[PDB]
Design a protein around this ligand. Structure first.
Ligand SMILES: Cc1cc2nc3c(=O)[nH]c(=O)nc-3n(C[C@H](O)[C@H](O)[C@H](O)COP(=O)(O)O)c2cc1C
Ligand SMILES: Cc1cc2nc3c(=O)[nH]c(=O)nc-3n(C[C@H](O)[C@H](O)[C@H](O)COP(=O)(O)O)c2cc1C
Ligand SMILES: C=Cc1c(C(=O)O)[nH]c(=O)[nH]c1=O
Ligand SMILES: C=Cc1c(C(=O)O)[nH]c(=O)[nH]c1=O
Lengths: 313, 313
């Protein structure tokens, strides 16, 4: 029985990886993700310049999930590029690099420099169009004209296969329009669904207080709260983008959650909140639990059930 | 100690009511909600003509909440109007009537006939802008030009105070624009936040199947999944609509959950999924639990903590 996958011209031991932003900021974090049993890893979304991000507390977790308004802390593009160029051991696993510049121009500037490294090393770009936690910068992918602009400019400037990190949508018309935009861009080879469910508000009853400091306590939700949202967006894009790959992200704590993602159409499966709370040992557990489910059902490979969710009637 | 409010020229014994669509479809249901210890009730959202709604199964519940694509089954506006005009005992509690026509013209036709019964009996209109389960009819309040048209035409035709049931938003810019649209209308006196989180997907791992039949298994999420999203929206609108009331709905299962809604800004607190699962006895428990949290903290009135959620720094 077999968790292996071969996509985007890379071989993966298994479909699991961190979600961008979790355990991927520093050289130490990246070496740790590389030493884990994950199939791949993705670096922290980066900006051209280093950023401290928001004041603390800016992340909090609870039994049903997490809220964050990190504010895009990162070591800067120069660092992640060097990591991809000189530091990462590609014989261990493939590496994705996530970028999230605050304007199209900043993105374009980064991808121009990433291109020769991607050509030479095989690093894969994840372009983040869904940051919900910068004030005055609502999610780019909630504005379909802006989204089209960003993807035009990045396709032109980069000219290699890349993927995009999408926010969650909640409306059939938005699924239809968003997939249609993405389908205009043949270099977009994968779509990662989803980023956090934006601008939730956790309130502590005892202290009568919000639990994160930035934005008056408003922040992106992950974890158990979001699984069915995440599964909907995976399947919605899987059905709407038949020539692209869909990576799942949201609500994965178990092999069973990963199984559902895969049924829904996911190729890679990313782990955020649960990985933040449990640490990189989660990857061996998720592998075992997914293999147990497959063995019980008679599935010998991932592609035997990927996208095979049944509807009624 | 007793939980009294005077909102919208009506008196209420406590801030609890059903969420529209739960336990409010038939005469029996409404008599049941009237006989409960709820502070008020709201009728099932109605259309001009009766509707059978979508094929079954169309609702399912789970430890973390519910998914539904009911398809707006209802007995038709003539029935709900007649319930309001002739059958409801206003001496027991106030009644809200929810309308959800599939076009601006259908809503205008209904409110013209509701107006005389609102004038005679005091029934309160809740105009639903947020139904996520009719195929080819995406949520009206996710299109701000359509939302404006609906509130202009209803305000003109109805000419009396009313409220609106809103879908959840997830983006600060959308909160800003949605609240500004609402603020253009002085007859909109209350804003109910929120309707179900639209188009989630629940998948059963054993059967590999979606669990509802309509829309390929896609439906609105309610229950524990949505509490932080609901809090966010109640607070967002409470902050941006200082001259309107905010009614909270989403994820209420306990007195503590209602305490958080009120802290975030809620005047009335609506109970959907939990009421569907537990039944109308929930209302005595919610009251008892809310009173007990108030006593332990020394609050004697709701007014003392409504909207008083603390931020950090
Ligand atoms: C602390 C934190 C940092 C994150 N940073 C990023 C990021 O830099 N870029 C990004 O695309 N998403 C980021 N995310 C979102 C995750 O990648 C993921 O989309 C979201 O957490 C949902 O997955 P989960 O339910 O497993 O948490 C972050 C999430 C958390 C909790
Ligand atoms: C079976 C079912 C039917 C519903 N019908 C309606 C409706 O007719 N009108 C409406 O405005 N909301 C309707 N809703 C949404 C609820 O009013 C409520 O906004 C949502 O369930 C979130 O609250 P909860 O977390 O307490 O369930 C319905 C919800 C359920 C589960
Ligand atoms: C890149 C910023 C993001 C962040 C962040 O650094 O604030 N948090 C998220 O949940 N998603 C993001 O996309
Ligand atoms: C009015 C129809 C609605 C329904 C429904 O009848 O399908 N379900 C919801 O969750 N929200 C609604 O607004």
């Amino acid at each position: 029985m077999c968790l292996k996958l071969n996509l985007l011209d890379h071989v993966f031991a298994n479909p699991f990886m961190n979600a961008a932003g979790v355990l991927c900021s520093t050289e130490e974090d990246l070496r740790c993700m590389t030493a884990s049993s994950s199939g791949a890893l993705v670096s922290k979304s980066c900006t051209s310049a280093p950023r401290d991000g928001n004041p603390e507390p800016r992340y909090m977790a609870f039994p049903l999930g997490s809220i964050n308004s990190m504010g895009l802390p990162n070591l800067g593009f120069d660092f992640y590029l060097k990591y991809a160029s000189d530091l990462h051991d590609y014989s261990k696993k493939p590496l994705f690099l996530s970028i999230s510049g605050l304007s199209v121009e900043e993105n374009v500037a980064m991808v121009r420099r990433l291109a020769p490294v991607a050509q030479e090393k095989g690093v894969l770009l994840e372009l983040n169009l869904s940051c919900p936690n910068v004030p005055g910068k609502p999610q780019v992918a909630y504005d379909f004209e802006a989204m089209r602009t960003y993807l035009q400019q990045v396709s032109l400037a980069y000219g290699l296969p890349f993927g995009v990190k999408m926010p969650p949508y909640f409306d059939i018309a938005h699924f239809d329009t968003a997939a249609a935009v993405l389908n205009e861009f043949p270099l977009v080879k994968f779509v990662t669904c989803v980023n956090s469910v934006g601008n939730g508000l956790v309130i502590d009853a005892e202290s009568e207080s919000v639990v994160i400091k930035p934005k008056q306590g408003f922040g992106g939700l992950g974890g158990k709260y979001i699984l069915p949202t995440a599964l909907a967006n995976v399947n919605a894009f899987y059905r709407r983008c038949p020539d692209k790959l869909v990576f799942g992200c949201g609500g994965v704590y178990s092999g069973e959650d990963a199984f559902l993602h895969i049924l829904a159409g996911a190729s890679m499966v990313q782990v955020g909140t649960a990985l933040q709370e449990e640490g990189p040992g989660i990857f061996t557990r998720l592998e075992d639990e997914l293999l147990e489910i497959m063995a019980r059902k008679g599935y010998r490979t991932l592609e035997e059930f990927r996208g095979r969710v049944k509807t009624i009637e």
